[PDB]
Subunit: 225 residues, 2 copies
């Protein structure tokens, strides 16, 4: 199967040590898109933020924010698949008796709730969260309180359906456990040199580079650029 | 959306207090099926065993064994999605330096490997397994050495395509942790009164019953009988 679409984790794979966007990665993406590849970006940040990457970086596929819970379309519209009414309420309550706190970007969230929390309160909040049908994990700039099933697997399955692709026509690039939901799918997989052992274990290609420089080598390996 | 297909995990949902099949559950399935419902059964058993359930229980849809890795189709054929060459090899090697041992039913396995092991060796073996792209867990009658992504979510997604349904037209019934994958999909969800706390929290309908009695209640709730 020839790769037709690549779903990339923004924070895990397109940035450097200082979290700045990698320019070589941007050039690799543009070069590959010029050759027919469709690219989709996925992030835990808010939709206007990933929207900004779409228009400035030049992403030709849809982009997702809030870990797959909200997407910006090819027709310029925004669609969310989960609501933040419950996660927002959970935060309001927990913040009354824990260090769990709201973050600035929550003002632009629509399908989940981001937060900061003292490491000591993580175990307790996670148990309360799961008893409520939510899950929590960290990615990018913060922790994210999400609805169960609101993840990257959801987003990649959505892309597959939107583009009528076979799983093997899809390549996913990630780096850690919060990317496992999409790596456990029957898609093609690639990761950076600093990816977790479990992600490397199931990847079709493990790059010799990281911090954005794995994109160019990955695409060259799959003959996409 | 109206439910058109129910994907049901056998163990803990179709079994009673003695891990025996519930006769009330069997009659409930046959009744719903007469009224138009397609039912699919999933479990960790080998394919001839779930095949036995299909023909004697009277299941009108596909059945899955080895936790989703092998299916007995509507055309009397068996389709395997993963291979057991690698996992069988792993068990062979590990058995030479750990308590991990093959089990009789592996004589009928085709897409994964079943096993027994002393509890204290679990950690050593899981670490070795994950470094090879496999996973291990206990369910039903033994431990299971699976390929990453070989699960009930893989199976339900397959049913979705096979029947050209939308996730909202699919109802899943499960109760234990290895059933959680189906619950992470955008399908309709239900569980028995004694399902895990996490499953209960993400289910749309939680039954007042268990040991097979929940199937009737669940079907009625969704106007399936
Ligand atoms: Ca990641
Ligand atoms: Ca990273
Ligand atoms: Ca973020
Ligand atoms: Ca593959
Ligand atoms: Ca058991
Ligand atoms: Ca079960």
């Amino acid at each position: 199967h020839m790769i037709r679409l690549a779903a990339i984790d923004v924070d895990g794979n397109l940035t450097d040590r200082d979290r700045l966007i990698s320019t070589k990665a941007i050039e690799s993406i543009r070069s590959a898109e010029k050759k027919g590849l469709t690219v989709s970006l996925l992030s835990g940040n808010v939709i206007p933020v990933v929207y900004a990457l779409k228009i400035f970086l030049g992403i030709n596929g849809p982009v997702f924010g809030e870990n797959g819970g909200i997407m910006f379309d090819n027709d310029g519209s925004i669609k969310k698949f989960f609501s933040n009414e419950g996660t927002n309420k959970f935060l309001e309550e927990m913040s009354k008796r824990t260090s769990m706190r709201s973050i600035l970007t929550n003002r632009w969230r629509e399908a989940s709730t981001g937060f900061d929390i003292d490491p000591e309160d993580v175990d307790y909040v996670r148990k309360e969260a799961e008893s409520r049908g939510f899950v929590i994990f960290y990615s990018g700039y913060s922790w994210h309180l999400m609805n169960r099933g609101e993840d990257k697997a959801f987003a990649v399955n959505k892309l597959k359906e939107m583009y009528s692709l076979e799983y093997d026509e899809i390549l996913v690039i990630g780096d850690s456990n919060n990317d496992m939901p999409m790596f456990q799918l029957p898609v093609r997989k690639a990761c950076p040199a600093n990816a977790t052992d479990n992600i490397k274990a199931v990847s079709d290609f493990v790059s010799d580079y990281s911090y954005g420089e794995e994109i160019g080598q990955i695409f060259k390996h799959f003959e996409l650029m």
